[PDB]
Amino acid sequence: SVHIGAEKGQIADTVLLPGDPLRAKFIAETYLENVECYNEVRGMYGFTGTYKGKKISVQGTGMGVPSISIYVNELIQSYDVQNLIRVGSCGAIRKDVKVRDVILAMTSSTDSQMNRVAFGSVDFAPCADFELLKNAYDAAKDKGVPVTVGSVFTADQFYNDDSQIEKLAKYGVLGVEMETTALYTLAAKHGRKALSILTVSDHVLTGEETTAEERQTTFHDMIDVALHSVS
Amino acid sequence: SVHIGAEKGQIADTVLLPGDPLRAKFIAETYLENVECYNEVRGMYGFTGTYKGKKISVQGTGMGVPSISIYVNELIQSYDVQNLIRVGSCGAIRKDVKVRDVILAMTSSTDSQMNRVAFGSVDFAPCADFELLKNAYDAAKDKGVPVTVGSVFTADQFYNDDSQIEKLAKYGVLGVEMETTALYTLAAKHGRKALSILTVSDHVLTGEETTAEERQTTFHDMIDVALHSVS
Amino acid sequence: SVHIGAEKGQIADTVLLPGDPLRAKFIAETYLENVECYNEVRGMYGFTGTYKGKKISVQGTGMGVPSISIYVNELIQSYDVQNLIRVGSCGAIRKDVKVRDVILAMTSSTDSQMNRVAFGSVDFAPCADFELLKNAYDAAKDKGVPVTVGSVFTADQFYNDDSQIEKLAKYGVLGVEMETTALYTLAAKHGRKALSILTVSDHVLTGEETTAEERQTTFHDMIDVALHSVS
Amino acid sequence: SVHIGAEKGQIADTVLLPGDPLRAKFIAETYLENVECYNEVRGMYGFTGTYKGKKISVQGTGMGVPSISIYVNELIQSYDVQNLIRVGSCGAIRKDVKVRDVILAMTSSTDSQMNRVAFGSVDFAPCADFELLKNAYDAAKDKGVPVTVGSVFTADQFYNDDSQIEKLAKYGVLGVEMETTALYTLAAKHGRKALSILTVSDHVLTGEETTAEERQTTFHDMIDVALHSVS
Amino acid sequence: SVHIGAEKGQIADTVLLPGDPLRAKFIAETYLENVECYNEVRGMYGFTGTYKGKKISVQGTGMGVPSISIYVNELIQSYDVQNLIRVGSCGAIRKDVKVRDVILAMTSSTDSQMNRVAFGSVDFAPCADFELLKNAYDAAKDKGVPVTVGSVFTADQFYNDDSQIEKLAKYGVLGVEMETTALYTLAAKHGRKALSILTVSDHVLTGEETTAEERQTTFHDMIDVALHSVS
Amino acid sequence: SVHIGAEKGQIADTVLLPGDPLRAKFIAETYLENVECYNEVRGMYGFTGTYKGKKISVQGTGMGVPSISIYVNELIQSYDVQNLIRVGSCGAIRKDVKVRDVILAMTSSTDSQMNRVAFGSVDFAPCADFELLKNAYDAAKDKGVPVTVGSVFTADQFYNDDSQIEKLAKYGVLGVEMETTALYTLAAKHGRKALSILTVSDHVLTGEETTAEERQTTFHDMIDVALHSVS
Ligand SMILES: Nc1ncnc2c1ccn2[C@@H]1O[C@H](CO)[C@@H](O)[C@H]1O
Ligand SMILES: Nc1ncnc2c1ccn2[C@@H]1O[C@H](CO)[C@@H](O)[C@H]1O
Ligand SMILES: Nc1ncnc2c1ccn2[C@@H]1O[C@H](CO)[C@@H](O)[C@H]1O
Ligand SMILES: Nc1ncnc2c1ccn2[C@@H]1O[C@H](CO)[C@@H](O)[C@H]1O
Ligand SMILES: Nc1ncnc2c1ccn2[C@@H]1O[C@H](CO)[C@@H](O)[C@H]1O
Ligand SMILES: Nc1ncnc2c1ccn2[C@@H]1O[C@H](CO)[C@@H](O)[C@H]1O
């Protein structure tokens, strides 16, 4: 497959999907035994290893719907991937979404035209796989990790002048990132299972940033929750 | 409030929302102790009673987004309703959604312009309250009732010539009804909790109808699951 | 037919269509000789009777485009109805539309996506049948009843935050209701004849309500005009 | 005013609006006493004269919504024109619209974005002035001229590849031209009175053309009907 | 062809396209040897003549996308025209576009739905033929004529209330006219070559008009540049 | 700035923008004297060096509109970049676009909603800076390199099922890539200069791939043309 330089079998049934290919290294290195690096195409590194005896691959996706859509397609069609779990951050758009919370996206809103191109007059609401969602929820509660479950907002432009996230915040949307709608939709189309799990990098509407220590912490939590989300 | 002829306090914190005002009778009569009929405006009957000592109201909504939007607004603004649970049927659009399954909608797709009018360029994906969703899920599993959790499709036209539910079925959508997007959105806007729970009246794509006995059964299950969905 | 529990022949060639199923009773009872009640499905009552020897049916439609679309379809396809006349109220959006005026809608604007789904890039302007329109006009003038003839606005949401009826008022639109675009379109598609006749329940833009006595009066006028609108 | 080279008062309260500036000559010359030519800007001739003692101006508009919109604006704002009556032809899109019929447009559908730019999510249905419409109707019947009253279709492209007039024909639309939506909308916005009256140049869907003699005849009828449409 | 009353061969491979049929006279008369007038249909005059021994036709188009689209279609399909060069004016929307500048449009923005009807979800950006563009550029520089090369804005309404040319000015768009998107698109579809060359009639955003003498001058320049744009 | 880990001054006035951060290395290494690596954030490497004494930076952008939009914003706002030149490949959609041709995009079509979000009813046609465009054109012809100048298509989805590039090919569009509309628009908004220069990786519509040797060749040409495009 054009964008992933892996051979058949090198990629696990389950893949974690950080936006950052260097967080794809750090994860694979700091959490998995017997790492391999299957892809180095474009510097978007993929790694396969084991956690508790089991195969888990970790692939970087890049930023924005088009980028992740490329990898999520090839991972599914070309390497028959069964479980896809994005693990990244997001800006929070509500006061009551706290900097230590870990977000599991049930659904995602978007201003990307990726869906409107496919459907036309229908607002297509993507959907996380409820099994993968439940398992992550349980896995978080069992260990006592704080967790918020609601919707998110997949943006096309990081620096939006015509920013309606003020209106979306009023409707309950928890925060904004730039991939989930893609993951959830492509997974659903091909009959696979997806889930986004997201930490809070900052509050967008109060400007307030989170300290690097808090990020390290909840970043670690996310990955733990991730790693138990299967079965 | 214009459409509901109730006095302050007559309506419970929790309201069930069947489309059919005569199923609003049957429910209230066959399941609740000490029924009252607060509303008879338009023949869209509302009833308040108790189940296991606790107050539970039951209000008919009518068919289509505009109708339910009227009642869900007044119920929230005028009578401070905290929990809104739709209980109705839907046509299934997949072979693997079985006639005995009970559907809990995480999210809803729509061709209603209700959201596009409010947002413009954003596909707004509505969202069930995860607490009410979990509780219903648990309540179903505890008693062994079969349950599917995924997305649905809120249509504007019952008899759609330009029917894209063929394309939606391919993306995983479980079935089609005509209210949920409204409920979920209005609930979320005003900071309340909503959930749709739906039985399967028939398969739309195989034409195949379900026998009246199967309907009676899963209708009963739905209402039981409903009644435990709180706390 | 699924939503109407009538047998072949029980429904007249001509049907009046009040939104309110209890106004469907009141009309049939207070104006027709030898009433029957053919439908009690959902409590959306239909009645057939005679006025001046002639058959006239009266069917409740419910609120919003989706609801009336259901009944108007089945009435046409399943019971070959030739003449469909909605008789309901509307909120006025202009100072010069007076509380005693009776409105005959030539056409209707809408924010419902029902048409855009069918057409795409075309603004489809629905159209009253000019014969039924003329006859009602004549019938009003012959008896001296005040009558305004222009366009209306079929809304999807009764409580619209993004309310552009301020802009529509400037373009001449007389008032807002929630059914006509549906009636006019479905009638036209299947080669039948439709017309909306509407009283003014209140002014939306001046808040000002109309007294119950004025409503009783113009309600009665509407129904008289209706009853002469044929031939 | 930029596009009309007339002085205050030279233009009548009532103006006829043929698309063709040379049909603007022929009309003024063959039907009016004491003709003047107020405008020669762009060769889009305007003429003022009398018919039965009364002032009637005749202005060419050009082809398409943008063109007529220019003239209809200046005629209204700059010369306070009260009555605007388009008189042109159209291609018929139904078998039952006959070549001798004379069409009075109640309303117009369009694929022009002129309205969507102003409104956004609302399908704005333009509307003929019912007084001018009635008078023309009466004036036709009094003299026995055959007349069809329904909707039309204002196109942007004369040679449309993506032609949906096949779908519009099924919904009752009588024929296609390229101005009416503009006239009706601008008239309504500024509180003036408009009406389109149209002959049938040909059938578009059967290819069949009309003979030049039939055109001369119904062209003459149109203008007679026009000339009585006032008071 | 319906709108052009010319016989085969009377129209040149190259045609200039002024909006104004009387500027179509003035050009043909003041610049070409051995003029003919092939078309007088609608008073939209076409002329064929020679400049430096070579055939050059000059056809008036009228105002707005629909009008020019009619002529540009027939000129191409019916008379196999190879080179189409619009020569008209525009209102400038930037301070740095000077009244003496001559504008060559690389591309055009539009609120016309002509493209969205053909494409749907795709913003189609029209495109000038780079050969005709270069030649005009060279021809201007060789003689020292000041020239700006960028984008323009094809409007549907001359008098736009919802005028976003304030936002377009910020994105670099040089000025507004009402034809180019049509020319460029139809030329490209049928594999022909087009270019718009435009003088500045006024600044729209500073209200400031240009004196008639400046217009005469740059009008003349435009036509000279035009006449060298071939080969 | 969040995504670029460079200090003030480390980035040149002119930046080349390959999609591939490893082609950003190869370029900087194989063509520039005294390379520095200012950014290693996300592995999207930026390099500053000299070519013929002059500073030229080279920054990787990633795939898709959202990705390049991030870098093009920060490069402009945070490091005052004056000249931005994308250098990447594209799939060709016409037979007459040859595998050795080098494409200079005048404009770009798109199905990205990035523009429709900002404008609404306006198709915004982006625009290359004509100076940078001319210079590249000259630089190609002076050395005899084959060059095609026309429009392109910025897609959101690499694997488009609803692929209208069949219709776009008919309108003259030369090929499809996933960045240009972003570059051209953001450059224009902030008053900077942009240009895309693209090689042909393959023909999409004939499936036919290009041999690796041909890619090496035209890749080299592109970069040479790039390097002369200034002044
Ligand atoms: N405040 C924000 N607004 C938009 N996206 C944000 C944030 C914060 C984090 N992200 C995520 O990081 C990537 C781009 O920074 C994106 O891929 C996204 O997932
Ligand atoms: N096959 C179908 N298509 C659309 N709606 C359907 C079904 C089956 C059930 N429903 C639900 O019933 C109401 C209208 O029948 C609607 O309110 C809806 O909830
Ligand atoms: N002020 C208003 N805004 C919107 N709809 C209104 C009114 C007043 C009356 N109606 C009509 O009544 C039904 C809902 O109240 C609707 O079916 C409608 O026909
Ligand atoms: N068959 C057709 N399709 C579209 N427009 C048509 C016809 C026939 C007549 N018209 C009218 O004539 C002008 C352009 O020919 C237009 O202004 C229009 O009013
Ligand atoms: N200020 C403006 N706004 C819009 N169009 C303008 C101008 C100035 C000139 N034009 C051009 O002239 C015709 C209509 O006046 C149109 O055909 C157009 O090409
Ligand atoms: N056949 C194609 N379809 C779409 N994009 C293509 C191609 C060929 C090359 N590209 C360019 O490469 C990146 C993704 O492969 C994109 O960034 C794009 O610029």
DSSP string, chain B: -TT----TTSS-SEEEE-S-HHHHHHHHHHH-EEEEEEE-GGG--EEEEEETTEEEEEE---SSHHHHHHHHHHHHHTT---EEEEEEEEEE-STTS-TT-EEEEEEEEE--SHHHHHHSS-B------HHHHHHHHHHHHHHT--EEEEEEEE-S-TT-SS--HHHHHHTT--EEESSHHHHHHHHHHTT-EEEEEEEEEEESSS--BPPHHHHHHHHHHHHHHHHH---
Q: Which chains touch A (3 or more CB pairs under 8 A)?
A: B, C, E, F
Distance A88 CA to ligand 1 centre (A): 8
Q: Which residues of D touch F121 (CB under 8 A)?
A: 113, 116-117, 120
Does residue D205 line the site of ligand 4, with CB under 6 A?
Answer: no
The answer to whether F and C touch (≥3 CB pairs < 8 Å) is no
Distance C178 CA to ligand 3 centre (A): 6
Task: Please give the single-letter amino acid code of residue D69.
Answer: S
Please give the Cα distance from D151 to D175 (Å, whole number): 8
Please give the Cα distance from B183 to E46 (Å, whole number): 62
Is D26 exposed, middle or buried (CB count within 10 Å of its CB: 0-12, 13-18, 19+)?
middle
How was this one solved?
X-ray
| Ligand that lies nearest to the alpha carbon of residue E64, given by its number in the listed order | 5
For residue F24, the SS3 value is: helix
Please give the Cα distance from F159 to E49 (Å, whole number): 52
Place of tokens 């390379």: F35
Q: Record the resolution, in angstroms.
A: 3.2
Maximum distance among all Cα pairs of chain D, rounded to whole angstroms: 49
Q: Where would I find the H helices in E162-207?
A: 165-170, 180-189
Q: Which residues of C touch A121 (CB under 8 A)?
A: 113, 116-117, 120
Please give the Cα distance from A43 to F62 (Å, whole number): 10
Is D145 exposed, middle or buried (CB count within 10 Å of its CB: 0-12, 13-18, 19+)?
middle
CB C17 within 8 A of CB C85: yes
Please give the Cα distance from B216 to B26 (Å, whole number): 12
Of the candidates F86, F47, F48, F45, which has an alpha carbon nearest to the alpha carbon of residue F68?
F86
Task: Please give the single-letter amino acid code of residue B116.
Answer: R
Distance E200 CA to ligand 5 centre (A): 9
Rounded to a whole number, what is the distance in Å from the CA of D176 to chain C's nearest CA?
A: 13
Neighbours of C211 (CB within 10 A): 9
Give the number of domains in chain E: 1
Please give the Cα distance from D129 to D183 (Å, whole number): 11
For residue A38, the SS3 value is: strand
Please give the Cα distance from E176 to E174 (Å, whole number): 7
Task: Please give the single-letter amino acid code of residue E230.
Answer: V
Please give the Cα distance from C32 to D3 (Å, whole number): 61
Of the candidates F189, C202, F66, which has an alpha carbon nearest to the alpha carbon of residue A156?
F66
Q: How far is CA E41 from CA C3, C188, D20, D69, in A?
A: 59, 38, 9, 22
Please give the Cα distance from A224 to D176 (Å, whole number): 65
**Beta-ladder partners of B85:** B16, B195
Which of F86, F161, F178, F180 best tests ligand 6's pocket when mutated (most atoms within 8 Å of CB)? F178
Q: Which residues of F touch D113 (CB under 8 A)?
A: 121
**Beta-ladder partners of E57:** E15, E48
Q: Which chains touch D (3 or more CB pairs under 8 A)?
A: B, C, E, F
Nearest residue (CA) to ligand 6, atom 14:
F63
Distance E8 CA to ligand 4 centre (A): 24
For residue D31, the SS3 value is: helix
Residue E132's contacts (CB-CB under 8 Å, 6 or more residues apart) are E83, E85, E193, E194, E195, E229, E230
Minimal-distance CA residue of chain B relative to D122 = B117
- The H-or-E segment that residue E176 falls in is strand E175-177
Report CA torsion sign: E135, E136, E142, E146: negative
**Beta-ladder partners of B39:** B46
CA dihedral D137, D142, D147, D151 (to 10 degrees): 10
CB D121 within 8 A of CB B118: no
Please give the Cα distance from C231 to C80 (Å, whole number): 18
Measured in residues, chain A has a length of 231
Does residue C183 line the site of ligand 3, with CB under 6 A?
Answer: no
Known catalytic membership, residue E202:
yes
Q: Can you give the C-alpha Rg of chain C in angstroms?
A: 17
Query: For F60, how many CA atoms within 13 A lie in the half-sphere containing its CB?
Result: 27
Place of tokens 């009075």: D104
Please give the Cα distance from A214 to A201 (Å, whole number): 9
- The H-or-E segment that residue E225 falls in is helix E212-228
Please give the Cα distance from C76 to E4 (Å, whole number): 48
In this structure, what token pair is assigned to residue C190? Answer: 């299947």
Long-range own/partner contacts, residues F140-147 (CB < 8 A, 24 or more apart):
F140/F102, F140/F104, F140/F221, F140/F225, F143/F224, F145/F102, F145/F221, F145/F224, F145/F225, F146/F98, F146/F100, F146/F101, F146/F102, F147/F101, F147/F102, F147/F103, F147/F104, F147/F225
Q: Which residues of B touch F120 (CB under 8 A)?
A: 120-121
Please state the separation of Cα A83 from the chain's center in Å: 12
Q: What phi-psi label fits residue C53: left (phi over 0), alpha (psi between -120 and 50 degrees) or beta? A: left
CB B228 within 8 A of CB B87: no
In this structure, what token pair is assigned to residue B111? Answer: 């061709």
In this structure, what token pair is assigned to residue E45? Answer: 């005059």
Nearest residue (CA) to ligand 1, atom 4:
A177
State the helix-helix crossing angle for A65-77 and F65-77, rounded to 10 degrees.
150
For residue E87, the SS3 value is: strand
**Beta-ladder partners of B223:** none
Terminal-to-terminal C-alpha distance of chain C: 29
Q: Where would I find the H helices in D53-106?
A: 65-77
CB F130 within 8 A of CB E105: no
Backbone angles phi, psi at C70, to 5 degrees: -65, -50
In this structure, what token pair is assigned to residue A5? Answer: 């330089």
Does A109 sit within 8 Å of B122, measured CB to CB?
Answer: yes
In this structure, what token pair is assigned to residue C72? Answer: 């108007």
Backbone angles phi, psi at D29, to 5 degrees: -70, -50
CB F184 within 8 A of CB F108: yes
Minimal-distance CA residue of chain D relative to E114 = D156
Of the candidates E110, E103, E124, E16, which has an alpha carbon nearest to the alpha carbon of residue E65?
E110
Place of tokens 């930029």: D2
Please give the Cα distance from D229 to D105 (Å, whole number): 14
Residue C53's contacts (CB-CB under 8 Å, 6 or more residues apart) are none
Of the candidates C16, C42, C21, C11, which has an alpha carbon nearest to the alpha carbon of residue C31?
C16
Backbone angles phi, psi at F186, to 5 degrees: -70, -40
CATH number at residue E228: 3.40.50.1580
CB D23 within 8 A of CB D33: no
Please give the Cα distance from A20 to B191 (Å, whole number): 34
Give residue F13's domain range: 1-231
* Chosen from A109, A113, A176 to mutate, greatest number of chain F CBs within 10 A: A113
Report CA torsion sign: E90, E94, E100, E102: negative
CB B226 within 8 A of CB B16: yes
Strands D102-110 and A175-177, by their bridges, are: unpaired
Maximum distance among all Cα pairs of chain A, rounded to whole angstroms: 49
